[PDB]
Design an enzyme around this catalytic site. Structure first.
Site, short mmCIF file in Angstrom:
data_model
loop_
_atom_site.label_atom_id
_atom_site.label_comp_id
_atom_site.label_asym_id
_atom_site.label_seq_id
_atom_site.Cartn_x
_atom_site.Cartn_y
_atom_site.Cartn_z
N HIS A 1 -12.28 -1.41 11.86
CA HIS A 1 -11.65 -0.29 11.48
C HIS A 1 -11.40 0.54 10.37
CE1 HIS A 1 -9.67 -4.08 10.09
NE2 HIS A 1 -9.07 -3.38 9.17
N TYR B 1 0.92 -1.38 0.00
CA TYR B 1 0.00 0.13 -0.05
C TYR B 1 0.90 1.20 -0.07
CZ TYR B 1 -3.87 -3.00 1.15
OH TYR B 1 -5.00 -4.11 1.21
O1 OGA Z 1 -3.69 0.10 4.99
C1 OGA Z 1 -4.89 0.43 4.59
O2 OGA Z 1 -5.12 1.16 3.80
C2 OGA Z 1 -5.95 -0.49 5.28
N1 OGA Z 1 -5.43 -1.76 5.86
C3 OGA Z 1 -6.29 -2.62 6.64
O3 OGA Z 1 -7.47 -2.47 6.50
C4 OGA Z 1 -5.66 -3.50 7.33
O4 OGA Z 1 -4.43 -3.86 7.37
O5 OGA Z 1 -6.54 -4.54 7.88
NI NI Z 2 -8.38 -4.16 7.42
#
Ligand code: OGA
Ligand code: NI
Ligand code: ZN
Lengths: 8, 348
Positions: B269, B170
């Site tokens: 989250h 990411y």
């Molecule tokens: O880093 C991100 O954009 C989102 N990551 C997540 O939702 C995770 O690691 O569970």
């Molecule tokens: Ni996640």
């Protein structure tokens, strides 16, 4: 299938 | 045992750090899972990669522009795929005057700027890139090979599900966001921030997840009627002021470069990146996850969403319940406070 950060 | 369900932070020694699954059992014996999210700061000596100087040619095949619509703490994010670009090309854009992090003192200031400005100047998120920046010899907390029971999927069936049992990268910029969600099949996740600016998280305790879903369904009644599990579309953003206003318990935490976040089964989250950064992430499991997997409410309305066959897990780890479960009579109720069975070691 794959994990995806999101759609539209 | 963490009765407040607050986000806990851990500082393992290298000795504690070495066995991943074991350390997850440990943090659960301390009640960490009750928050839905935990931070693990690894020992200073540990590094997954000697340097990140060689990655500017790495390709981001499908970077997404994040268009956000809404007001008053309730938003929908539309993720529009742009052309492939390199990490060099991405970082140039991320640090440019147009897209770079605004000036601020206290974190509460940056957080207010995020919630004020998230529908303006849509950023680009270099999300869901297949790969790992770990060196091959790194045996501790290697997102490529954590050695959890989630390996039973590929081992038994041959099925690889990208990002779930393989690693994703990411590449973030200021105001890039991840919407409220739990993981595919209500799995755990692990997230390592390799370098760059922080990533900020919000989390709702699993014991209050249902309350968040009820609230979301009221706020977006159209979306809920077309899909039970519409939060799994990962398009729904809800501010902490809205959560506070409707009595949803939640906590916040900021992850810095060099830190791990762990998300727990059914822990909702959401968050945002502060600036140019790079994270690595995958899913994983413990024995406690199996019941969560069995009861996960999945999105029906989209094609080829992630669905994992639970059969192999129930047979191996719940042989007493297999016939009952297969007959549709397994009425197990999940107690979200209980740590995984493997934590017995630390509670004896
Ligand atoms: O880093 C991100 O954009 C989102 N990551 C997540 O939702 C995770 O690691 O569970
Ligand atoms: Ni996640
Ligand atoms: Zn759906």
């Amino acid at each position: 299938a794959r994990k995806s950060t999101g759609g539209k | 045992l963490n009765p407040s369900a607050r986000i806990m932070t851990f500082y393992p020694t290298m000795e504690e750090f070495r066995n991943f699954s074991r350390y997850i059992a440990y943090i659960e014996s301390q009640g960490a899972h009750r928050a839905g999210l935990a931070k693990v700061v690894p020992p200073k000596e540990w590094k997954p990669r000697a340097s990140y100087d060689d990655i500017d040619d790495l390709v981001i095949p499908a970077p997404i522009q994040q268009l956000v619509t809404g007001q008053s703490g309730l938003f929908t994010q539309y993720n529009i795929q742009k052309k492939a670009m390199t990490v060099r090309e991405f970082r140039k854009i991320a640090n440019s005057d147009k897209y770079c992090t605004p000036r601020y003192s206290e974190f509460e200031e940056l957080e207010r700027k995020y919630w004020k400005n998230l529908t303006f100047n849509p950023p680009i998120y270099g999300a869901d890139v297949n790969g790992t920046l770990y060196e091959k010899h790194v045996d501790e907390w290697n997102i490529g090979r954590l050695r959890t029971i989630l390996d039973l999927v590929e081992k038994e069936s041959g099925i690889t599900i990208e990002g779930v049992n393989t690693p994703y990268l990411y590449f973030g910029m200021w105001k890039t966001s991840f919407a409220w969600h739990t993981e595919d099949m209500d799995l755990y996740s692990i997230n390592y921030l390799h370098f760059g600016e922080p990533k900020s998280w919000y989390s709702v305790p699993p014991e209050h997840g249902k309350r968040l879903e009820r609230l979301a369904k009221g706020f977006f009644p159209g979306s809920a009627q077309s899909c039970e599990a519409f939060l799994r579309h990962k398009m729904t953003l809800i501010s902490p002021l809205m959560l506070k206003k409707y009595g949803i318990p939640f906590d916040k935490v900021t992850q810095e470069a060099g830190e791990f976040m762990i998300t727990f089964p059914y822990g909702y989250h959401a968050g945002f990146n502060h600036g140019f950064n790079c994270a690595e992430s995958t899913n994983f499991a413990t024995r406690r996850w199996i019941e969560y997997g069995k009861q996960a409410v999945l999105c029906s309305c989209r094609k080829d969403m992630v669905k994992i066959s639970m059969d192999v897990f129930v047979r191996k780890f719940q042989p007493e319940r297999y016939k009952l479960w297969k007959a549709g009579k397994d009425n197990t109720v999940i107690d979200h406070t209980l740590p995984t069975p493997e934590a017995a070691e630390f509670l004896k």
